Structure 1
Amino acid sequence: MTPASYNLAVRRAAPAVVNVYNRGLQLEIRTLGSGVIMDQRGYIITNKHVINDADQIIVALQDGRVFEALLVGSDSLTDLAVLKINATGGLPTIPINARRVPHIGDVVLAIGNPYNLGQTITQGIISATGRIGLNPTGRQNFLQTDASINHGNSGGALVNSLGELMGINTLSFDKSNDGETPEGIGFAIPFQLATKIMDKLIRDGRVIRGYIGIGGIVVNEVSPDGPAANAGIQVNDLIISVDNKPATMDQVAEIRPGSVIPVVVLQVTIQEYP
């Protein structure tokens, strides 16, 4: 027989997972992390928490090359950041299958640089999808996995047995309150969302979201309100059609500022989410 192995996925994807170093003024390493080479142009996704307050960001490929990288953009909400390196002899890129839909139970491999020991691969499965993550009241779409994720894995890749990118490993449940240590609970930003964020970053330098004038279906805040909610809308009440579309959270941010949008229960201009 032949030994059971996910070496295929490793050979296909690991080469594109790089080690990220956030150095800060002499220049000293402030934090380690990982990153994924998305395409030949040299664009790399990583966690914003990894490259924050970096005086100089360095990327090191598994093939030995090392580059200084350009921070094209970052997003707090998604904790995503996009880097750029200018290679010339070709770059290894992460396999991406946009038609593939991750399923709970799919086998996955976490690829990163844990504690700077060097690139390591860990395997688990997709434990859940559509998870708000480590902290509620500020939901998101997270992928949950039990593939061992440690400090250093952030910004790295989560791939299936074919080497296809499933997500970008972000943080991990380190300790539930002041009591014990959770085991096998890690999160990753879904590749589909990371791709949509990367493109926005490459194009604008940041994510331009469409904000209007409400916070906290019904409409009412458990704390004060804002200005922009004075273009032609009531106080606290539900709504239906917004910009020739029946009821909506992700669509208002998807609209770019400057534009005027009609509402009901009749026009407002889109401001940028502060």
Structure 2
Amino acid sequence: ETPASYNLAVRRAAPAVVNVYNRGLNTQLEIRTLGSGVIMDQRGYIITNKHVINDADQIIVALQDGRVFEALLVGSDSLTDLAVLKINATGGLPTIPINARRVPHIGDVVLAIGNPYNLGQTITQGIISATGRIGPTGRQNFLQTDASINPGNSGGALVNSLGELMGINTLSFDKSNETPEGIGFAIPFQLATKIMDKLIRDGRVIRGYIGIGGREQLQGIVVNEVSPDGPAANAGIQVNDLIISVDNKPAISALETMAQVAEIRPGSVIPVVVMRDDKQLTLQVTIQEYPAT
């Protein structure tokens, strides 16, 4: 007779969850912000929230086995509130279980591993409240969860009963009207990984940019705004016109497209077919790089 337990996922994933400390020196060293981190690979690279290590003079990463390192900011993305830290480990490193094929379903039991209020590594249990949750940028595409999330869980791991990483705890719903209960958000591992591999490889996230604002007869993304001196404006794209296709790919979803654009190497001239006056217009556009925050 064994008690129902998620200790398995705990022993599997908890080790790979670290305590990330941001400290600054003031007229000496003191912690200005603390959160959590998730060791993804053996190389020592760690994913965390950018808002955890912002303006960090020194980033201290504390593991559960006692070891304490000095993290190296590999890069950060304010667009997805993500950041990667590097740590040189001569000894073996615990990694987070990752299943790229795993599709998180609503209702899956999840565990939130982090360091709430610097009490130590806390494991809270909940489920996946929802998926594909945005919030305006729409880049975050959060997974909602009712697993107890608190200040110190940011950058922490959200794993299932198998210990497999599901997301990176980033947000707790704070909006009144009272105090929101059991509503937290996390970056899907699919996105967290995509950003990590890109931060390590480029020192930052490099995104294509058409300088267009639009929201999804023919089916296409409608343009609402056109960034001045932006690739769109330059090419001759207008707000009212409807984008049928982008770079030889159907503009079926405003969100799946913006992801396709972000993958275009800046400096690339791509076709963008639109619809003005019920007439198809093919406009060649030059991809810039996404403007700095």
TM (norm. structure 2) is 0.87
1:236-259 per-position Cα deviation (integer Å, ceiling 9, x unaligned):
31121221222x221111101011
1:156 aligns with 2:173: no
How far apart are residue 273 of structure 1 and its match? Answer: 1.0
| Alpha-carbon distance in 1 for matches of 2:244, 2:106 | 33
Contact 1:242 1:261 in 2 (8 A): yes
Partner of 1:171: 171
CA apart distance, 1:195? 0.3
Change (3 A) 1:260 1:206: same
Contact 2:212 2:225 in 1 (8 A): yes
Unaligned segments of structure 1, at least 5 residues? none
Shift in Å, 1:137: 6.0
DSSP 3-state at the match of 1:224: coil
CA contact (8 A) 1:19 1:34 kept: yes
- Per-residue Cα deviation, 1:143-169 (whole angstroms, up to 9, x for no partner): 011100011111000100110000000
Instruction: Output one character per residue of 1:213-267: Cα deviation in whole Å (capped at 9) or x when no partner.
Output: 3224211239977465213434531121221222x22111110101111222332
> CA deviation digits over 1:67-106, x for unaligned, max 9?
1011011111110000000001110000001111111110
Offset at residue 207 of structure 1 (A): 0.8
Residues 97 and 164 of structure 1 are in contact (CA less than 8 Å); yes or no, is this contact kept in structure 2?
Answer: yes
In the alignment, the residues of structure 2 paired with residue 83 and residue 6 of structure 1 have an alpha-carbon distance, to the nearest angstrom, of 28
State the shift of 1:197 in Å: 0.5
SS at match of 2:272: coil
Higher strand share: 2
SS of 2:11's partner is helix
- Measured in 1, the distance between the counterparts of 2:184 and 2:263 equals 28
Change in Cα spacing, 1:210 to 1:227, as seen in structure 2 (3 Å) is closer
- Asked if the contact 1:169/1:188 (under 8 Å) is kept, the reply is yes
Q: Which runs of 5+ in 2 are unaligned?
A: 215-220, 251-256, 275-282
CA contact (8 A) 2:207 2:263 kept: yes
Mean Cα deviation higher: 168-177 or 100-109: 168-177
Asked if 2 retains the 8 angstrom alpha-carbon contact of 1:215 and 1:225, the reply is: no
RMSD of aligned C-alpha atoms?
1.8
Q: Give the Å deviation of 1:175.
A: 3.7
Q: Is the 8 A contact 1:104 1:126 kept in 2?
A: yes
Compute the TM-score of the two structures, normalised by the length of structure 1.
0.93
Alignment deviations for residues 38-83 of structure 1 (CA, whole Å, 9 cap, x no partner) = 0000010000000001011010100010010110111111100000
The offset of 1:202, in angstroms, is 0.5
Residue of structure 1 aligned with 2:239, choices 218, 235, 239 = 235
Return the alpha-carbon distance in structure 2 between the equivalents of residues 99 and 221 of structure 1.
37
Match of 2:243, SS? coil
Q: Once the two structures are aligned, what percentage of the paired residues are identical?
A: 99
Moved more, 38-47 or 236-245: 236-245
Cα distance in 2 between the residues matched to 1:254 and 1:105: 32
Partner Cα separation in structure 2 for residue 139 and residue 73 of structure 1? 18
**Alignment partners' CA distance in 1, 2:232 and 2:24:** 39
State the Cα deviation string for residues 192-216 of structure 1 (Å, max 9, x = none): 1100000010111111111113224
Contact 1:214 1:225 in 2 (8 A): no
Q: Call closer, same or farther: CA 1:235–1:162 in 2, change over 3 Å.
A: closer
